[PDB]
Scaffold this motif. Structure first.
Motif, PDB file in Angstrom:
ATOM      1  N   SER A  17       0.814  -1.190   0.000  1.00  0.00           N
ATOM      2  CA  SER A  17       0.000   0.000   0.000  1.00  0.00           C
ATOM      3  C   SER A  17       0.856   1.253   0.000  1.00  0.00           C
ATOM      4  CB  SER A  17      -0.926  -0.018   1.210  1.00  0.00           C
ATOM      5  OG  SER A  17      -1.639  -1.247   1.252  1.00  0.00           O
ATOM      6  N   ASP A  33      -2.066   0.377   7.961  1.00  0.00           N
ATOM      7  CA  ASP A  33      -3.490   0.186   7.876  1.00  0.00           C
ATOM      8  C   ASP A  33      -3.655  -1.081   7.050  1.00  0.00           C
ATOM      9  OD1 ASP A  33      -6.159   0.373   7.485  1.00  0.00           O
ATOM     10  OD2 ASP A  33      -6.098   2.565   7.289  1.00  0.00           O
ATOM     11  N   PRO A  34      -3.848  -2.254   7.697  1.00  0.00           N
ATOM     12  CA  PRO A  34      -4.008  -3.545   6.999  1.00  0.00           C
ATOM     13  C   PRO A  34      -5.051  -3.510   5.880  1.00  0.00           C
ATOM     14  CG  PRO A  34      -3.631  -3.897   9.307  1.00  0.00           C
ATOM     15  CD  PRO A  34      -3.978  -2.442   9.150  1.00  0.00           C
ATOM     16  N   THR A  35      -4.664  -3.860   4.668  1.00  0.00           N
ATOM     17  CA  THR A  35      -5.593  -3.775   3.564  1.00  0.00           C
ATOM     18  C   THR A  35      -6.388  -5.042   3.301  1.00  0.00           C
ATOM     19  OG1 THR A  35      -4.467  -1.949   2.435  1.00  0.00           O
ATOM     20  CG2 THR A  35      -5.632  -3.561   1.058  1.00  0.00           C
ATOM     21  N   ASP A  57      -4.716  -3.024  -4.995  1.00  0.00           N
ATOM     22  CA  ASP A  57      -3.945  -3.248  -3.775  1.00  0.00           C
ATOM     23  C   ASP A  57      -4.566  -4.380  -2.957  1.00  0.00           C
ATOM     24  OD1 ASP A  57      -2.335  -2.988  -1.548  1.00  0.00           O
ATOM     25  OD2 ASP A  57      -2.676  -0.826  -1.397  1.00  0.00           O
TER      26      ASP A  57
HETATM   27 MG   LIG Z   1      -2.011  -2.743   2.687  1.00  0.00          MG
END
Ligand SMILES: [Mg+2]
Ligand SMILES: Nc1nc2c(ncn2[C@@H]2O[C@H](COP(=O)(O)OP(=O)(O)NP(=O)(O)O)[C@@H](O)[C@H]2O)c(=O)[nH]1
Lengths: 166, 749
Positions: A17, A33-35, A57
């Motif tokens: 990201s 921020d975990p996607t 992403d």
């Molecule tokens: Mg991510």
């Protein structure tokens, strides 16, 4: 206005990201921020061809591995990213490589091995290993850093070019 | 006022009829009704919410189907929120409020408002969650799990994309400002004489005192040579007394020529204000080619119509879902007692906007069976339309359609339609107006091109350009789908399907930027066939999927869009990535064709096994359904299938065979000849399950079907094995399958 669909994959935390948001907003995000799955678009002019980039992403947490087939299918080009300070993620890069070949029943899928976080001192993944592996896969290898913008635009454009040579 | 008249013009334009007309009126009921409806209007307008009205959320109180609760994995549902060239997948709980979902996403953007492209200054309270590509908002204190669109997505297994954008301005929904001489005397009528301009035995007159389809008294006159102006000047006194005349009583006058009926006209004995009719009357009669046979309206055609003449004595004058639908049984011809009808409408008020949407058509038609123009039934429709923009939309076209092709009721539906327009807001009027321009525009082209019946193929493109250049709206709201805004017209893809009639194949570039695709909107503008039929078959079809939904069954029906925009004119939605079975067989020959095409369209193998499962269900859904409606025997050309294996019939207009279950179909289920198959078994099981589910509502279905025919229905009663039990009916269907299982391509070729 050709539309190139690029997909960024890799382990969790490798910086998919950051690399993306970097190339999109030209800025480096420090927070993690975990996607799950974010999408971004950017009109770019590669070699004067003025195309449109569809950057997808993806997630790294195996908690969403299911949706990999989905995108792995509609994906035109994959940016296989891993961190150079985290070995695992490197090994996990093979996992993505195979599922992509399978899901696309091809051996020429446009891919780019990306070594990231090169701005970190404590490396643990020699470039020789990464180069060889990339050499094995028969795809380019590009070290990057979403922090110092090293190799960022290059990685992505090399993919757009891989997609063109395919 | 002039302005008040400039606005009237505007309305008479949408209505399609002039309510200020008096040419064909023998009293004032219409005028009286036009003023009588003002109160209900303001009342509904005054109480509606400017916010939610303009946003018109589509929700439901029904619980969530089991086949849907299973869909949602853990206690969450993925939602993708879009803005610009950016979008993100967020986790959300089925019980989460749209507003709650928006507070979350906003906090997740504590320092990223720039990415999504959300003006730092722009407040968060000033945002709404709108389905991408369509005018469907997700707003109001309602669990995300109760919005129809969500259910739609979960069901069809599609992803949910909402675009974070700005709410509509409620300010755009502005509304403009603005006793007898003796009641014991036996009623009697004097028949002066008939009369008629031109002419094709002998003929007499028949006068009946009626109360609905119920005839009380009845008198006739001395037979006479059917000249051009036969006279009688005779008094026909009936056995009924003035006071004994029932509210809504009718004076039915028919002309007979074994005698044959040729003409007929009706006169309300007891006017709306409960006053016996009196005086001299010259009623232009109706001519034989039922509710039309009950209309109190006279023939608009004063110039060339049979006119009967009567004279009535004068006097001295100083100066709980599929359940409520069963109530519709009290709103047909069988019940005319105003009171009884009222109770019924009252009972209908407890329905939700979603349910009214499902009966809107039946209800509209039911208005014909009303003695007077102003009724609870009309007020219910008026209110339910002024209360919800989606109902209002369809109430418009349903009325504008009846007005455009039924002079027996054009006057009444018009007064009602105007009542609605006068209070649906300015925005709504505009949208209505743009749509009218188009359907009225393409209408011309259809006749301009159908009269040219290839060089015509170019005539279409040409004519499209004329419109294409400053004349056709920059974009309009698709009639059969209020949520779809068709913009630009892709003339290239436009053509002229060749068939009995000459339908127009038009493609429109979506006018929505947020639209998650470059696909175009396909609408078939067809002239000739009366889309009234299709609408009824579809309207029922949907009431079936709900009948099955209350039993956790998803037969995968595909009730495509279709709305009648006028007389023998209208449009039918186009289902992309879908072709006819015929075309598929035409692209080859072997009983394996259809199955091949499928796999050939399905990407991954897991995808194919899906279309197969879906084919199984859809095919069962239509078999059962088409059989109970008596329309199974069809041609491969009238059956379509989507690349994802969803079978579905189209073009509704109705050796022997229960339904369509040809070899190619059976093949896909893994069977051939007389053998079986795990999938074919599944098929049978579903069939029977669905079939019985419908029988559990045999009544609702007959009341819904009969109501239609009124504007032999003893067949559906058999198809529904009425009388027989489960274990018996179950065998009845299975047998019907075997019939198709043996006819092969007999009926098809
Ligand atoms: Mg991510
Ligand atoms: N030093 C350095 N840190 C980086 C680099 N790229 C990303 N990071 C940091 O590593 C963390 C995780 O980055 P992120 O881009 O979210 O990783 P991801 O692979 O997309 N995560 P996920 O798999 O959950 O989707 C962030 O705090 C980020 O600032 C890089 O090139 N150099």
């Amino acid at each position: 206005m050709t539309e190139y669909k690029l997909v960024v994959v890799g382990a969790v935390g490798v910086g998919k990201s950051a690399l993306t948001i970097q190339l999109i907003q030209n800025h480096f995000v420090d927070e993690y921020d975990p996607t799950i799955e974010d999408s971004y678009r950017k009109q770019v002019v590669i070699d004067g061809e003025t195309c449109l980039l569809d950057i997808l992403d993806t997630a790294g947490q195996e908690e969403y591995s299911a949706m990999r087939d989905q995108y792995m299918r509609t994906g035109e080009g994959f940016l296989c990213v891993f961190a150079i300070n985290n070995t695992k993620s490197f090994e996990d890069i093979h996992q993505y490589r195979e599922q992509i070949k399978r899901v696309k029943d091809s051996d020429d899928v446009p891919m780019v091995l990306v070594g990231n976080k090169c701005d970190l001192a404590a490396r643990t993944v020699e470039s020789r290993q990464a180069q060889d592996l990339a050499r094995s896969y028969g795809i380019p290898y590009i070290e990057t850093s979403a922090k110092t913008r090293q190799g960022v635009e290059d990685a992505f454009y090399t993919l757009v070019r891989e997609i063109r040579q395919h | 006022s002039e302005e008040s008249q400039a606005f009237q013009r505007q309305l008479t334009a949408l209505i399609g009829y002039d309510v200020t007309d008096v040419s064909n009126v023998h009293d004032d009921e219409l005028e009286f009704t036009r003023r009588g409806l003002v109160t209900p209007r303001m009342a509904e307008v005054a109480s509606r919410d400017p916010k939610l009205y303009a946003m018109h959320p589509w929700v439901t109180s029904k619980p969530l189907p089991e086949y849907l609760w299973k869909k949602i994995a853990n206690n969450c549902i993925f939602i993708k929120i879009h803005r610009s060239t950016t979008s993100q997948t967020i986790k959300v709980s089925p019980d989460d409020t749209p507003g709650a979902i928006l507070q979350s996403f906003f906090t997740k953007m504590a320092k990223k408002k720039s990415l999504m492209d959300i003006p730092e200054s722009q407040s968060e309270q000033d945002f709404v969650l709108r389905v991408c590509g369509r005018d469907e908002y997700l707003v109001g204190e309602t669990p995300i799990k109760n919005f129809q669109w969500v259910r739609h997505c979960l069901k069809n297994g599609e992803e949910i994309h909402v675009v974070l954008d700005t709410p509509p301005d409620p300010a755009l929904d502005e509304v403009r400002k603005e006793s007898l001489w003796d009641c014991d005397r036996k009623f009697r009528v004097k028949i002066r004489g008939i009369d008629i301009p031109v002419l094709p035995l002998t003929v007499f007159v028949e006068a009946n005192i009626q109360h609905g389809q119920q005839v009380l008294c009845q008198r006739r006159t001395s037979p006479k040579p059917f000249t051009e102006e036969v006279l009688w000047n005779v008094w026909l006194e009936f056995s009924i007394k003035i006071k004994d005349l029932p509210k809504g009583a009718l004076l039915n006058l028919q002309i007979y020529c074994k005698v044959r009926l040729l003409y007929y006209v009706n006169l309300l004995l007891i006017d709306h204000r409960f006053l016996l009719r009196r005086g001299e009357y010259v009623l232009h009669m109706w001519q034989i080619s039922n509710a039309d046979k009950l209309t109190s309206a006279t023939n608009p055609d004063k110039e060339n119509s049979m006119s009967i003449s009567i004279l009535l004595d004068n006097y001295c004058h100083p100066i709980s879902a599929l359940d409520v639908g069963l109530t519709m049984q009290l709103l047909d011809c069988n019940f005319s007692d105003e009171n009884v009808r009222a109770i019924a409408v009252q009972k209908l008020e407890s329905l939700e906007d979603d349910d009214v949407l499902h009966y809107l058509l039946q209800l509209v038609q039911a208005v014909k069976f009303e003695p007077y123009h102003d009724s609870a039934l009309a007020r219910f429709l008026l209110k339910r339309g002024l209360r919800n923009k989606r109902i209002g939309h369809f109430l418009f076209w349903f009325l504008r359609s009846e007005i455009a092709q039924s002079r027996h009721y054009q006057q009444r539906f018009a007064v009602i339609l105007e009542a609605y327009l006068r209070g649906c807001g300015t925005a709504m009027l505009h949208d209505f107006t743009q749509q009218v321009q188009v359907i009225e525009m393409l209408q011309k082209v259809t006749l301009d091109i159908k009269s040219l019946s290839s060089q015509v193929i170019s005539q279409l493109k040409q004519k499209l350009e004329n419109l294409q250049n400053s004349q056709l709206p920059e974009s309009f709201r698709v009639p059969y789908d209020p949520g779809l805004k068709a913009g630009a017209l892709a003339i290239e893809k436009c053509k002229v399907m060749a068939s009995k009639k000459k339908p127009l194949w038009l493609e429109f570039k979506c006018a929505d930027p947020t639209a998650l695709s470059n696909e175009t909107i396909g609408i078939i503008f067809k002239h000739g066939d009366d889309l009234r039929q299709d609408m009824l078959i579809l309207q029922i079809l949907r009431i079936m999927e709900s009948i099955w939904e209350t039993e956790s069954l998803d037969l995968c029906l595909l009730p495509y869009g279709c709305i009648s925009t006028g007389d023998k004119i209208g449009m039918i939605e186009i289902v992309k990535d879908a072709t006819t079975i015929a075309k598929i067989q035409q692209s080859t020959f072997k009983d394996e064709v259809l199955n091949h095409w499928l796999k050939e369209k399905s990407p991954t193998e897991e995808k194919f096994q899906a279309a197969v499962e879906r084919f199984v269900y859809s095919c069962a859904g239509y078999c059962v359904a088409t059989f109970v409606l008596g329309i199974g025997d069809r041609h491969n050309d009238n059956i379509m299938i989507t690349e994802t294996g969803n079978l579905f019939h189209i073009d509704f207009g109705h050796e022997r065979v229960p339904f369509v279950l040809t070899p190619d179909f059976l093949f896909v289920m893994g069977t051939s000849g007389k053998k079986t198959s795990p999938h074919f078994q599944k098929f049978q099981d579903i069939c029977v399950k669905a079939y019985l589910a419908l029988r559990h509502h045999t009544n609702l279905l007959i009341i819904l079907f009969s109501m239609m025919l009124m504007t032999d229905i003893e067949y559906i009663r058999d198809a529904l094995t009425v009388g027989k039990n489960e274990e018996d009916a179950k065998k009845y269907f299975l047998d019907q399958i075997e019939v198709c299982r043996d006819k092969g391509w007999t009926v098809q070729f």
